[PDB]
Design a binder for these strands. Sequence first.
RNA 1: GGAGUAUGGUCGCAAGGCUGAAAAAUUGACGGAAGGGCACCACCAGGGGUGGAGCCUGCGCGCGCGCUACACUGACAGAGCCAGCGAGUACUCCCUUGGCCGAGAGGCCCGGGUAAACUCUGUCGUGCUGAGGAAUCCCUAGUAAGCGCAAGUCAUCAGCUUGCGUUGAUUACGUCCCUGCCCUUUGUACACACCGCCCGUCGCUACUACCGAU
Lengths: 49, 83, 108, 119, 67, 297
Amino acid sequence: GTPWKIFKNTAFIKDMFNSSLEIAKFEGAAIRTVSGIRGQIKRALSKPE
Amino acid sequence: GSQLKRLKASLREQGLIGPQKSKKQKRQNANDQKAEALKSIREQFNPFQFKTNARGPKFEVTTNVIKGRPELSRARSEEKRRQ
Amino acid sequence: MSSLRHAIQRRAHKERAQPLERQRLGILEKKKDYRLRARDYKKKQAVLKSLRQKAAERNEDEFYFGMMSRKGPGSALTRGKGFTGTVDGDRGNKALSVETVRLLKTQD
Amino acid sequence: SLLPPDNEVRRKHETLLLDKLYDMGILSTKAKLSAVEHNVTVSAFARRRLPVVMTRLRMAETVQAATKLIEQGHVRVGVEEVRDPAFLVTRNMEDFVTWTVGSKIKQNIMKYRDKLDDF
Amino acid sequence: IEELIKRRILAGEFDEVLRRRPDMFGNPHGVRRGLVADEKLRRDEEEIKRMWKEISAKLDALSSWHY
Amino acid sequence: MLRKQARQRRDYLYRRALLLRDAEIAEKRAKLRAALASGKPLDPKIANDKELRKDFDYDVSRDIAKEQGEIDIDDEYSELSGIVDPRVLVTTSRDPSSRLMAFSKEIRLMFPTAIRLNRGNLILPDLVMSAQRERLSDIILLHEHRGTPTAITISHFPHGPTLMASLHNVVLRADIPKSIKGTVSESYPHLIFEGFRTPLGQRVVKILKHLFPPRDPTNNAKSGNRVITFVNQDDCIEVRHHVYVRTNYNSVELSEVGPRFTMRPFSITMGTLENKDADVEWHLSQYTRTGRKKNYF
RNA sequence: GGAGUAUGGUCGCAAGGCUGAAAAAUUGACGGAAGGGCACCACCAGGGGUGGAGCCUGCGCGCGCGCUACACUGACAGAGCCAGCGAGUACUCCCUUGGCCGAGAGGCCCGGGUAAACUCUGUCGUGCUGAGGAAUCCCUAGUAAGCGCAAGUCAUCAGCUUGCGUUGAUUACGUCCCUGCCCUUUGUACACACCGCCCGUCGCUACUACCGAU
């Protein structure tokens, strides 16, 4: 994906998925930016599918 | 009333906490049910075995309450997700 | 060991570069860049922290002698709109009394 | 320490001496008799006198000048003023020893920090 | 968890805070307050009592009685 | 007041760093003392540090008394543990919602010496001020998500440690109609704890079980009507609130009356609620390599 | 070599089934009557949700919880006058018609989808242009409620969480009558002062004698 907005910690990420369904399959997903920050996918965002 | 008082009075009704009787009371009792009573009492006074609405019905309709059990439900499902 | 390795073993990896359809957003931050960011951010937050340390444990009632001789922070209401809680150190000018100004203006 | 270690009265007065001196501030811990032995010191007393502890609370710049202040008398304790510059400030009173009522000093502080109430 | 509770309440133990008395430390036997060699050790003990009494006089009295 | 609490709390910190140095010492001192009774030989450094030997001769009695359990350790709890009754207030978040407010009423009821408080328009620094001017044991928050509570935040006041935990698997008091539930007894409940086997487990049990009143000790194992349980597995401490009647010396029946929680503690700070600049003690470490493999508690 | 510490492997015991799932009690078990203390899960004065319609996280089509709408507390035009929290070299809602300069990868330019509030001045006037039952649940002071502004903190939380400020009432603030819950009827301190042997059904114990088999 690529980040859409960036708050302090929690970042939205947009262009990775085609559906909330695919996301909630990948609930709790072990995600990782290139720079080496680890992280976790937690919920699908609702308004842009 | 309280959980405690209702359980105490129901059990005294059930004779399982009533005072230690005599031989003579034992003879009278042997001279003159409780299983299903206890099971239903248990299921009641541990109400969190299940969900209900607190409200009661949005509309009374007359023609001739547990709302489903989270614990058995999620248990059965996890068995299926296993299998 | 170092003599138990090929030269092509010793060869390097090169880092990838930002997708050319995306150079708009600046460089592609990798681990060098990340740690340099977090170096500076840890440092500046630790300095903020030690500052709030001193402000919380601040005695309400101290008294040095610069207080008779400086110009304080004051507050929002005191200075009004040019208020930043730092305190003013005079650049080095002063009120010239008359005779000096006369001699200067004479030279001018 | 000469008393055998296993005694009640020993235990009671270890605790008593320690916690009492600790509430006199002259220590730093309250669990070590060896610290009482080679630590309890007239120097620590002096650093719990009054002017030294008002330097520590930052009333004034140097403990000399602090002596000069409290000799003029701007420095209150509790509700009294204090002249005797050996008023040994125990630890429950370090939090209280503050400036007096009608003091040019207190008004100077309020001058610098810009709240100078004339009332 | 209901099983564990059952075990403990039958075999009654809880990890509760209790109400420890404020005067265990000074009244280690807890008397009611109303109507009612070893010699060398005893001498040393009353001796330390005397030293302590005198120092505590000096201690309160030095501290100017905030204690 | 305020200069006083600043005074004492920093003195606690500095005395901890003191205890660090001296317990590093007493580690050595321990081995000396054991050798005297044992006659087993010792480390030669221990045999020949002179200030250590003299200092032994002074500071024996602490070691043996701690072996006896004669004293309880220096602690932000040990000052007033079973002496005086801890009063506790429960507050909601800033703008509460109604179901949340009912659930807070429920856990006020579970504690016996509590008050609830409408938070309303109140800066949380001044709520800490209200604390240290009414000498509370404990502040407690609640944060809902949408009608469902999510996090609680125990603080121990005047200055003590704070737990902060998420919640899950919550049930209210108020999903059951009052025809079946009822007013629950405000008797001093017992407490039980299962599976806390770290020193950190004992920290969290300490900050929990010093919430409740002191039981009277004469017949406490015999009396009593109400029992609160804390059990833990996979660092998700689950807590229930039960009430019981003893039908026999061989049989007993329980009734479940409180809300059912699982909370998993994710911030434990020797440091109160306002001080975000305080020393954390254990935080929950996701995002690491084996923060999932290991457990605390 | 000695002393410790670990670590693993070896060895012996534990490792032979009258057996076939579902008490203790001179101290105990259980009441009852009186008397006190308490509580927006009690009384009393009010207030305020949800529950009516739409939206949807959640939980188990049902269900609330939040958001929206619904008119006199109106609409339009002006005039004036007030906050607090926030600073990581860091921040963007699209995605698309064209064209520019780009042998090619792009970059352009043009199109399409430090507050609300409040006060005052003046213009027009109820006009699908309808504030939510029975029930239920909550609330006694900077509280109910209103109003925005920001942040987005290793758990949760953007279909929202959490902060900070702004304006700020009514109504009890007493009483155990209903509902309950707890605690007295033991101890834990003595002067004056006062009170003056609570009650029930059984258990356990010592003794007494009775009855009937062996």
